[model samples]
Structure formats: C-alpha cells, structure tokens
Target: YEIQRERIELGRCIGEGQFGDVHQGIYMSPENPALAVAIKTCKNCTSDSVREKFLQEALTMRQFDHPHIVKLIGVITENPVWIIMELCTLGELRSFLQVRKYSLDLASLILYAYQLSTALAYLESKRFVHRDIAARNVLVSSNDCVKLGDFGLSRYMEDSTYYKASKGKLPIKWMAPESINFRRFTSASDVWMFGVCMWEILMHGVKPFQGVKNNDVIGRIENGERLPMPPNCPPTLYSLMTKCWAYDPSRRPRFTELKAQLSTILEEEKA
Candidate 1:
C-alpha cells in the first residue's frame, strides 16, 4: 500500500540530521483522523551505504517492540524511502534539558536512568548494541516519557563485534576508552556510553568531555584518564559513572546489575 499518499503534511520541521530531515506528518483513516507521525525524508539515489543504513534502521527498529524505543510506523519507497515514525512533540532530550537547565531532582534522574537502562537491557537481550546512546539520540515526549531514537549507527553485535577506533565525525565525547583505541564496541562499551549519557542528563545536557579537543579526549581516555563528574552531581551517581568508565570493559556492570543498583538508589531517594 502507498504510505505517503495517506499522510497529510503538518508543515512542521521537527529535526534534521546528516542523513535527512524529519518532518511532522499525520496519517488519516476513517477511525483515526489525527494519527501523528514523523516523516524522515532523504535525497533520492543516495549512495548504497546511505540506503543500507536506512534499511538497517528499519530492520533494527522493527526487531524490537518496546515502549521506550521509538516506534517505526511505516516506510515509503516511492522515491527516496520516506521513513514514517511516531511523532514525538517534545523533541530531543538535549533540547529539553537545555530548556530546563539541568536542575533535575534525584527522583527524576533515577526514573530517567531506569528507563534508559531498561531499554538497554532489552537491546542486550536481542544482542543488538546501540553504538550511539546519548542525550541527543533520546527523544522526550510531552508526557516526559523517554524514547531512544537514532538507530542509524546501531548494529548487531553478533555479526559485527568490533568497532574500530578511528577519527570520525561521530560524538567523540561519549565514546569509551577502548572505543577510542581498538575502534571496537561491545555491550560493555554500550554501558560505558550510557554512563556518559547519564552525565549529560545530570549536567543538564552539557557536552561530555568538554573543553577537550576530540583527539585529546581520545588520547586522555586511552591513557587511563577518567572523565570528571560535574561538581553538583550526586556522589552515588558519580561513583556509578566512574565504574562504567573503568579502563577495562569487563569491569563495567552489566545492564541487569546496573538496573538493580539504580533501583536501590531510586527506592532510597523515594524514601
């Protein structure tokens, strides 16, 4: 069935990225008049690699059925494969934190972290590593639910186990030490990246590895340097972050362990 033919343009540009622009749209049916959707439009005849990436995104997103992960509504292949997705009115978590100025209470932090950890655990169960997990990749809805987005860089860890450390245009600050040297990524590396995401949220979306050049950030991390937690960050959270950033990936806690720890902290905070 033709997907775009059924969608009505909402005339709202929600986001733009290296691959394409995401616009707000709506799917109408006799039963549902305003089924909001986000349409990602890419240039036609893009390189094979770009096309592969788009297909991978659809495949990866389709593999999991989780509330915390963004939902893939449909794909339009008329010309330049228009990816129709759920509309997230709140936009990126980065923008949300920027507007809120990083003053989240402990309870809020616990809740967000729990949601992220839960999502990560789900991905791990499927052996899919979210190579890029950062605040910018997370979407917040009007009701404050966090949905992980941007699966363009994600891949099946079983098929491609290693991500080589090389200078690239991706977010360097959130990368792990091994990721910077061996150019390899694993579930452990994902946990490390999650720690940085936590830092970004705790610091109100401050850029990770701030004030350091990308190359220098790599060098320092490779040479056993640990990222300093923001001064205002809770000591317990700081301790967890340090553990996740340990030089040895094996030292990092698994998602289950991390979730349990976060749960305890959350319960205590609630008390």
Candidate 2:
C-alpha cells in the first residue's frame, strides 16, 4: 500500500530518529491558512515488535491530550505511518540552549524548569510516566511555550507497582539508581530524570555524561555518583537537584512538590 500524502506543503526536516523523521509543514483548515503543523513519518521496521511500537505511539498520542504535550492533529497508516502534529517554530530546547551558549541565569532556568515541571505534573496526574523526559524532547514555541514530545518511551504507571527496564532499553544518563541497577522504574524514577533535564537546561544543553561512556555513566549513577552542578547554578536549585537524585527513589520529591518549589523560585526571581 502506498502512503497517502496530505495537501500540506512539507518544508524543512525538523527532527529524525531510529523510528522516523519529523518535517515542518503547513495545514490549511479551509478557513485558516496561517496555521502550520508538524508531520512525523515512521517507516515500517523489519521487526514486528518495532512496528507494534509505532502503533503504540499512535494510540498513546491519541489517548493523551494536554496543552504542554505536543498535540496530534491526525494520522495516516499505510506502508509508512504519518502523524500530523502541531508545529513549533522555536525548535527544540537543545538547539536553543546551544545557540545561547548555556548562559541562562537563575531566573531563566527557574522559568523553564517550572514550565517543564508543570508539564510533568500534568502527565503524572494522568498516570503517565514520560520515561524519556530530556532536553531534546522539549520544544519551544514562538511565544516561548514549552511542549513535551516523544512519548514513544512513556508508559502508564500503576499504583504501587514498579517498572522494570526492558533489557537494553534505557536512556543511560537519565536513568535513576534503581533503573540502572535493578532496572526498576517508577514515578520517582521520572523525578530523577527531571532533575537531569533541569541540569541539561541550566548547562545550556550539554548532554548528560558529557564525554563519559554510557556504561560508565550508568555504573557511576548506580554507585550513587551524581553529576556535579554546572558553574554558577544557584545553591537552592542545586540542593533540589540533589534531592531528586537521591539513591532511594522513595525519598525523591513528587512532581507536585517539585512544582511548588519551582513556583516559589520563579516568584522570587520575578520579585
């Protein structure tokens, strides 16, 4: 079966991954021609499991609806599946941080982190855990609105249940101690990832682990070695990050608590 091409004019390639490529496109809603959208195309994989994952993404995206989450407009399934989503002109958080050379101050960091924490909290409220909450998955809009994307790795967190990391399936640097060791993941583990994401934003998009190998990073984190704070990071923020990275997942703060702390910091910064 041939893929059905939509009327939208595809523009530059915005992102790509092992599963698919995302393109910048414009969608004319009969009465509105100014709106733009993103088109993500995922090709069929030789492995049936990989194909199932693509289908899962479609189902997950449709089930999840939130302002902070990237909105899915529609989808087409043929030889290659295509997902139509809201277009973000401001690009990914990683690019923005790199262009700025990682020079954001405490206020800016608090603002960004607050927005992200808010998003994560919303997801948590829906019983979803964004397993891959990283800088690359965040998109900044024209108005500086942050939208979380890439939900392929996300899973619903069961009450009082733990998640075991599937073999060879982990984002090393963001993995919590339990995730690195026992392969166990949970809402608290996501909190750990959130802390690393904040560090990524504060450091101006530096990849976690820097030059360290993936195995070494996992080993170090499992052994309770946390990433050091970047130069000039606020003491309070650093302390919060330390709390998130605590070796005991049970000790990590919930998204709600993190949101509160971030709000206080943002208010102080504005004052």
Candidate 3:
C-alpha cells in the first residue's frame, strides 16, 4: 500500500549489471524526509516475462528478512519497473577487498564465510536457488554486514547440474563442473559455488581460474582440477574447500554444515 510512484525519488545510479541498474535514491513520504535506498530499475523491461521475473524478485525478497540478506523496501509498479531496497554503505564485498590490496585476516575471513553460509542456509531452508553466487553479487555495509542479493534463473528447463548451454550462459569460473557440463543444479550445486566464493575471499578477490581460457576452464574442471590453496588459508578450511569441490555432488556438504564447521575452525586455533 505504501509503495507508490510519488514516494520514491530516483537519484544517481549506484550500481549496474545485466539484470538492471540500482540507483541511489530516497523513499519520500508526505510528512517525512527522504529515506535513502537503492532502487533496482529493470533494464529492457518491455516484455511480459521480464516484468514478471522482476516482480517475482521483489516478492521473493519481501519474503526474506535475514540479517545477511538485503531488505526490499518496496516497489514502483509503473512504466519502468523498480525494486527498492536498503542502501548498503559499502559497495560489493569483492570491490571493498580488491580496492584494499590485502585479504582479510583469519578470524575476519572466518566470519565472512560464516555470514555467507548463514545467508545461503536461509535461502536453502526456503527451497530457493541463487543461480548467481559470485563475490560480485554480495554487498557489504559500513557496519560489516554482508548482504546476499541477485536471484536470477536459467532460461531453459533445467533441474539438474547437467550441462545445458541453451538454458543460458553460466558464470563458468564459479560454477560446479556438473552445472557447466550437464546444467545440473541443486542445493549441492550451490555448495559447490560457495566453495569458490571462499576462494575469492581468501585470495584477495582474484578471478577464479584467472588465466585459464573459458573453453579450457570447463575441460580442466572435468579432469578433476581445483584452485590451489591460498597462501595462509588454514588446513582445515582448505580441506573443507576441497570437499565442497568434489566431483560427486552428494559428497558436498550443505551451507549449514559448512557454517557449523567454520564456527569451530577459529576456536580450535584460538584466533
């Protein structure tokens, strides 16, 4: 009821991607000053399916209210579609790290991983899949809050991690081998992606398989290859990472399992 066109004042464009552009704006009300927010405006929103997906994103976000998840403020159901959300003080989590030239310390790194897993676990509990799970999709706030956003889907009918190029292109670098080859995806497939996310965190935001060509990345992964351990990554953590990257999806632990394990890593080392 409160979500009306007049209440939102679009400001500078804060973030942009293929899905849409997020603008820095203020949610205005008759008796109140503007409340800062990030409004995601749909791109090329001329088709009904595109409009439906945009609304589904808003509805899905509205249903979730986790500390590690971005909050959907409201929506503007007018000509150009809009999704209003809480403004994150810091930008993308990866940008914050890349701009700084150093990786987070062990304890800090552990917390980040815990938060990410917590967020994914929440999504898992709801039975939703976040096909996009790269570092770039997670946002950070000035107060150290990590918010996972972006819920896109494959275009074709795919229920497994089995490869399906026709369904759509995937972020091959951060994808599970099964998803790349067979387009198979499940909670376990997300677990595979979460492992890659940790690598980005520990390695100072380096692109996964930095030098490998796109075509070769999939081939190498099919041959049982994975990223080398980051210089100071803990042995147990690296061990867990490898487990997440297993060829058999059944072997990969869920986000909750990974989070619980991460909880124990620092206490044992007394860091």
Most accurate candidate by lDDT: 3
Model 1, which residues run further than 4 Å from truth?
A: 1-4, 7-9, 17-20, 29-34, 43-53, 151-170
**TM-score of candidate 2 on Cα atoms, chains taken together:** 0.80
Residue 37 C-alpha lDDT in model 1: 83
Report the C-alpha lDDT of model 3 over 2-78, residue by residue, as the tens digit. 37877777889876744588788788856756678888788766688777866766776788889898888777767
**How does model 3 score by TM-score?**
0.82
lDDT by residue for model 2 over 173-197, one digit each (tens)? Answer: 8878777677676789899999999
Each model's lDDT comes to: 0.75, 0.76, 0.78
Global CA lDDT computed for model 1: 0.75
Clashes of each: 4, 0, 11
Q: What TM-score against the true fold does each predicted structure earn? A: 0.82, 0.80, 0.82
